[PDB]
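Hey, sorry for the delay on this. The queue was backed up all week. Below are the sequences that define the complex (chains, strands and the ligand SMILES where applicable).
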Amino acid sequence: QYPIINFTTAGATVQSYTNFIRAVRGRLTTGADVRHEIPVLPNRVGLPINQRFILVELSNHAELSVTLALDVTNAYVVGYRAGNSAYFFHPDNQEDAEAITHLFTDVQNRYTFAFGGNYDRLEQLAGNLRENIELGNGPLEEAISALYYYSTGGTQLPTLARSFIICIQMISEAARFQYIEGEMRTRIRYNRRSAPDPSVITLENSWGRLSTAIQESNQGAFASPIQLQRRNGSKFSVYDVSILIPIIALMVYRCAP
Amino acid sequence: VQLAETGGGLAQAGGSLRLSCAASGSIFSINAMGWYRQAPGKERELVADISGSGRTNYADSVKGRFTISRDNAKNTVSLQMNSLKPEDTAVYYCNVVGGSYYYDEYNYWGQGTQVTVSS
Ligand SMILES: [Ca+2]
C-alpha cells in the first residue's frame, strides 16, 4: 500500500545504482517546490497519511530481501520489514509514532526499537564511527543479510546497527546529496569499499541546518555561514546556496516560499 | 530542550578556563554537542564539538590547547581551555543538535558565556 522501488546488489553497476537513487528522489518529492533550484521535500503538515512513506525493496546475491520504509518528509529510513516482521526506529514525537502504524500492517510481528535512528546512537551500538564503516556494493550486500537475519534472531545488535548505518548513507543520504550519491558511484565504479571521509560526514551532519540556511537565506545569501569539512578534515565555510546546487539534491521543508 | 552553560570569565594569557553545558528535555536522539565562539565584529566559528560516539572536531587554532569531553549519562559537555590567548576572547555559545530522522532536526543554542583573556 505504498509505492515500491526495487534495488539488488546482485550484479549492481554504477548505472543501476544511479537509476535507483534517481528513482528514490522522484518518489520522495515531485520537484514542484524548488527554492534556489533545489527541490523541497513535502511539508509534513497536511500531508495525507497515504502519501507519507515510500518503500525500497533491497535484494542481494543470497536472494534475501528486506523492505525499507522512507518518510517522504525527510528521506530517512524509519523502519524495515523482513519476512513476517517489521522494525521501526523510536520516533521523536507521538504524531510520527501514529504515522508508522500505517506501515507493514500485514506483518504479524511489529517492534519499535528502544533507540532512534540518529548516528550518534547507531554508532555507539555498532561500536564504530561512520569513519570506520566501509560503504559500497559489498557492504550493502552484507547489510541486507544482517537486516534479514535480524528477523530470525541471528544477527545481533552491533551488526544490525552497523547495517543501518550502511543503508541510511547509501540510500537516504545519497538521495539527499548528489555529492554522496557520487561518492557511492565511485566506490561501485572501482569495485572498492571504503569509509566516508569528513566531506561526506559533515554534509550528513548538516542537512537540516543547510536546509534552514537556504530557505531562510536573503536571496540565496546565508544569514550565518555553515561550516563543513573537506576530505582532509580542514574547514570549509558555506555562505551561499550557490555552491550547494551541485552538492545537495533535496531539502527538508522548513518554511513556505 | 534547555541548555545550562557555566564557566568562562576572565583569564590571563597562558591561563586556563573551563566551560560546561548540560542539556535536558526532549533529548532522546541528541547528537553532537559543542561550543561556537563569536568576537564582537567577527564571524561565528566552531571551537570544538563531540558526538555521543566520541568523534571530536576542533578549530585549527585551538588544537593542542583546548580539549572537549562528554558525559552521555548527564548529556553534558566540557571544554577545557588551556594556554589561553588574547585571540580566544569572545562570547562562547553551547550548541546541541539532534534528531531521530536526521542529525540536526533540532539545533539549540545556549545564552552565551563571555571569555576574556588579557594579552
Ligand atoms: Ca578528533
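Chain B touches chain A through 29 residues (CB under 8 Å).

I'll add it to the shared folder too.

S.
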